[PDB]
Amino acid sequence: RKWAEDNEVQNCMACGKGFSVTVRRHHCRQCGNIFCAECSAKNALTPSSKKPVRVCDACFNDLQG
Ligand SMILES: [Zn+2]
Ligand SMILES: [Zn+2]
């Protein structure tokens, strides 16, 4: 356990949703913050590669600007 360790990811740090077996866990690679299907419901492309990466809405703005 150091930092981004899903091991303790059972509560979205954005909305505060309670993860479970019915919902899957998500985690933004740009900022490094675990998000739920509600905050991670977005995919933006990166200039370092041709592929839609999944990032929280917030980061989505840092790339669409
Ligand atoms: Zn959320
Ligand atoms: Zn982010």
How much distance in Å is there from the Cα of 15 to the middle of ligand 1? 4
**Cα–Cα distance, 45 to 2 (Å, whole number):** 28
31 marked ligand binding residue: yes
H helical segments located in the chain: 57-63
48 marked ligand binding residue: no
**Cα–Cα distance, 27 to 55 (Å, whole number):** 8
DSSP 38: T
Quote the tokens at residue 32.
């490094």
How much distance in Å is there from the Cα of 54 to the middle of ligand 2? 9
Task: Label residues 21-31 b or e (16+ Cβ within 10 Å = b).
Answer: eeeeebbbebe
CATH of range 1-65; options 3.30.40.10, 3.90.180.10, 1.10.1240.10, 1.20.58.760: 3.30.40.10
